[PDB]
Structures are given as C-alpha cells and as structure tokens.
Amino acid sequence: AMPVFHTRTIESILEPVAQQISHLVIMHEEGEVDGKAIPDLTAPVSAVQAAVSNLVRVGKETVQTTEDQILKRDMPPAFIKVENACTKLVRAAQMLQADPYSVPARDYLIDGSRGILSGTSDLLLTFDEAEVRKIIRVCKGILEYLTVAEVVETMEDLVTYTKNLGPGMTKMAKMIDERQQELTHQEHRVMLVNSMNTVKELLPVLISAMKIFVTTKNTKSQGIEEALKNRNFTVEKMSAEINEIIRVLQLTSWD
C-alpha cells in the first residue's frame, strides 16, 4: 500500500508483496510492453486459492473465539475481499491457458493481487486494532485504580493499594514497551516511551505522597492540606500521561 505498514510484523509480511506488484505493474499493462506470452499460472494460482482458504479458515476461528465485537464485525468483510480477489486470479489463469497474450488476464492478475494485498492488509489491521484495544483496557484499568487513591487513609490500606497497583503498572509498562517496538513511526515510539517513563517514575512519588498523607492523617497537626495537594497532582499527572498513551496507541495513517 502507498502508506508505510503500521507495524514491523505486518511490514515483514506484506512489504514483499507490495513491491512485487509494483514490479508487475511496471512490467505489464501500466508499463513497458509485454505482448509476450505469460506462462500457465494454473498451478501458482491454485496454491494461492489454497492459501486463501487456509487464511479464511484461521480467520473464522478467530471470529467465533473472540470477545471483541468489533473484531467479529470487521473481519468477515476482509474474507470476502480476499476471496473475491482470488476469483479474479483463477479467471486470469483460465484466460491465459486459452490465450497467453490475453489483456484481460493481465489486468485481472494485477487487480487480483492488489485485492489480495488489500484484503490481507485490512484483516491484519483489524486484528492489530483488537490487539491495541487490549492494551487500552489495561491502561483504563490503571486510570480507574489511580482514581481510588483518594480513599487510602490507613497504613494497611496503603500497603494493599500498593499491592495491586504494583503488578498493574508492571503489566502496562511491559505491554507498552513491546508495543512501541512494533511501531514503524519513530515519533510515535518516542511519545509512548516518554509518557511511560513519566508514569513510571511517578509511581514512587505517588506512593510516597499517599504515605505522607496517611502518616499525616494519623498524627495531629496540620500538614494535611499540603499532603493532599501533591497526591492529587501526581494522580492527575499520571492519568494525563496514560491518556496520552491511549491517544498515541490509536494514531494511524492506516497502512
């Protein structure tokens, strides 16, 4: 596709196909002049037909095994696109068996290939978007939890809070680190890495702020109003960064 593929995985899978189609176009109908006979494609086309039914078999297993309602809705259209593109290639092989110089066959070869590239592309992006929603759910779960920081007023409730928040932050940090590495857009990787580091370094500051508050609200004298401000600031700065993470996780020029 004209745009860079979204992730390195999708890139390593489709880049070679996109390039080979360009070469085909340059060589054929939108290129030089190959009124030269194209060999029999019956075999290589049947192999595609088999690879297509395999992909669709795996894809359907995903649809009836996923909880993501969007994934269920968006994948079938891609099956149709790939299957329909395949039908043009089968037709191209037929025509070429009858006439190696068939012009319609050449246009079908190009359209069918583009169609399979496009359908496989949509299919992988739908999966990738489902994958990203999983990360956003973990991120929103931490947002929700930071929201209950207000409640903690006991030295033991603080140890309990920390007990949960610790792991959650670890899971999110790992998902973001692995996700950022898959991006093909550097500026997007940096934003995720910087936001994550900001949220990461603020975790101790938050815990330290809640402890100051608790030990404060368990010992007389007014140092309480203050303790309250820094805890709230932290919870806001962390939440803001996590929201920025959620935003960047969804950025795309498509692919």
Partner: peptide
C-alpha cells in the same frame, strides 16, 4: 495469536510466487 499471522505470511508467500511465475 500468530496462527492468523502465519496464515497471512503463507498467502503472502503464495502471491509472491504467483507474481514471480507471471514474469514473461
């Protein structure tokens, strides 16, 4: 979650092979 990715790589490979065979 990679069975879908492997199915896709397989199709990608098959199309690449087709385009290579189409070269006259």
């Amino acid at each position: 979650g990679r069975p879908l990715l492997q199915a896709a790589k397989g199709l990608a490979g098959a199309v690449s092979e087709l385009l290579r065979s189409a070269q006259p």
